[PDB]
Structure formats: structure tokens, C-alpha cells
Design a protein around this ligand. Structure first.
Ligand SMILES: Nc1ncnc2c1ncn2[C@@H]1O[C@H](COP(=O)(O)O)[C@@H](O)[C@H]1OP(=O)(O)O
Ligand SMILES: [Cl-]
Length: 257
């Protein structure tokens, strides 16, 4: 498919637009271009200070009938380290107001780490303000600690994952536990890796396409970021072809960062 299914049963489109900060309008324009090209998944973070701009882009898309709210998968994330658990629902409330949404499909949190911070997340899940809840940057050990005590297990662990940083341990642990791994920075320069250039030539694809497809074939969603409209489109062209097993195996020889 063009999606994975989370432990909640919800579908998460395999490709999303990644989150970042840029000059005024740049991110909104990317969101708009992405969704027009077929993206159904947008990753956001209040830390970038741009969720109102993204909300303006989403609002345009919806008003224009490009997509319905229900066919979008919107994610936001909170970095809550050393803040109160009570701040969590307030931040979600703010993100919803800025994005002009009634619910998030996914809300992710980081804190140092029964944890009351996670408790606050569970309540938002119970309420349907966050249809799925997860974590960002949790190692296998920390993700396992959380799984051992949570009432609602994390749906997602969003981490840096790419051919130069393959997260092999965490990938195995997510697969065994049913937590879905979303790869941020899925292009890392790993696009100059000769193994990737070679596979790209053998398959008649770009280096980025190969790198993205590799992650998808490990069962991971990917969050490529681009301000270029053509690269936005190419970053979605990861579905109607695959990397064969013999070429997929060569990824094991790439040097890790
Ligand atoms: N299809 C692509 N081919 C090459 N570079 C890309 C592609 N898509 C995005 N990028 C670039 O990758 C970087 C983001 O990588 P990551 O997601 O791993 O952090 C950006 O500098 C972005 O530049 P650009 O915005 O000019 O497209
Ligand atoms: Cl934050």
C-alpha cells in the first residue's frame, strides 16, 4: 500500500512532509505543493514557530477541495523536557488552534524519562484530541521502559533513520513490539554513498528515491523535507517499484556516522 497501519488501526501514509523552520511562507508553500502532488501526511512541530503558517496552507487545501480533513494525516510534536505534565494539554490546544484543526492524527512527545508526562498524553488520546500518541527520539531501552508501564502504548517512535544511520537495534525492537518507526531526516552526505549511487543506476531511480524506498521497505514511514517542487514530487515516487532483495542487502555495508 501507500500506508502502514499503526497499533491503533489507523493508517499512516508512508511518505510525509518533514518539519523544519525557514523564511516566512516557505514551509506553507511546501505543504501546499506537497498535498497538491499527492502527499497525505504532514509533520509539524510547535518548536519551529510555524504551525499557524501550516494551518493557513491546510486551510487553503481544504477550502479548495484538494483533500478532505479525514484523508490527511497530521502530526505535531512537543519537546517537554523539564516542564510540567500539565503543559502538555495546553500545548496541544495551542497546536490545534494554530493548525486550525479539531484533532491531530498523531501527537508525539519527548521528555527525559509511571511517568505522569505520558499520563497526560494518554488523556488526550482518550479524548480523541490526538488519535494516536507517540514519542520522539526514544532509544530501544527507553521505548521498552515506556512500554512496560504505559496503559496506551506508543504508536510511533520518530527518530533519525537513514542509510548512514540505520537504527538497526531500534528497528528490530519496534518490529517485535508493534511500535511504528517514522524516519526523520531520511536523506541524512548519504546521497553520495557509492552503494546508493550504484543501486540508483541499476534501478533507474535517483539516489534520494533509493534512500527513501529502502526505509519504506524496512517498514518505516519517511519524512523527506524539500522546498523544491520537483523534488517534492520525486520524494513521493516511491511506490510503483521496489528495491530487490539482493540490492537491499548491500545497504548493510554502508558506513555508519
Ligand atoms: N529528492 C531529493 N534529492 C536530493 N536532495 C533532496 C531531495 N529532497 C530533499 N532534498 C534535500 O535534502 C535536505 C533535507 O534532507 P533531510 O530530510 O534528510 O534532513 C534538504 O537540503 C533538501 O534540499 P531541497 O530543499 O533543495 O530539496
Ligand atoms: Cl516544543
Amino acid at each position: 500500500a501507500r500506508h502502514f497501519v499503526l497499533n491503533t488501526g489507523a493508517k499512516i501514509p508512508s511518505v510525509g512532509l518533514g518539519s523544519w523552520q525557514s523564511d516566512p511562507g516557505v514551509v506553507g508553500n511546501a505543504v501546499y505543493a506537497a498535498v497538491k502532488a499527492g502527499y497525505r501526511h504532514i509533520d509539524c512541530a510547535r518548536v519551529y514557530g510555524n504551525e499557524k503558517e501550516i494551518g493557513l496552507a491546510l486551510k487553503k487545501l481544504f477550502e479548495e477541495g484538494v483533500v478532505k480533513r479525514e484523508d490527511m494525516f497530521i502530526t505535531s510534536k512537543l519537546w517537554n523536557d523539564h516542564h510540567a505534565p500539565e503543559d502538555v494539554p495546553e500545548a496541544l490546544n495551542d497546536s490545534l488552534n494554530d493548525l486550525q484543526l479539531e484533532y491531530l492524527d498523531l501527537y508525539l512527545i519527548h521528555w527525559p524519562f509511571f511517568p505522569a508526562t505520558w499520563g497526560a498524553m494518554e488523556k488526550l488520546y482518550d479524548a480523541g484530541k490526538a488519535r494516536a500518541i507517540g514519542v520522539s527520539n526514544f532509544s530501544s531501552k527507553k521505548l521498552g521502559d515506556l512500554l512496560a508501564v504505559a496503559r496506551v502504548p506508543p504508536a510511533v517512535d520518530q527518530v533519525e533513520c537513514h542509510p548512514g544511520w540505520q537504527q538497526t537495534k531500534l528497528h528490530s525492537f519496534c518490529q517485535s513490539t508493534g511500535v511504528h518507526l517514522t524516519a526523520y531526516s531520511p536523506l541524512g552526505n548519504v546521497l553520495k554513498e557509492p552503494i546508493i549511487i550504484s543501486i540508483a543506476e541499476k534501478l533507474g531511480k535517483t539516489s534520494a528515491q533509493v534512500a527513501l524506498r529502502w526505509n519504506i521497505q524496512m517498514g518505516h514511514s519517511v519524512l523527506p523535507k524539500s522546498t523544491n517542487e520537483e523534488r517534492i514530487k520525486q520524494n513521493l515516487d516511491v511506490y510503483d517499484w521496489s528495491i530487490p532483495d539482493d540490492l537491499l542487502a548491500k545497504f548493510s555495508e554502508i558506513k555508519q556516522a
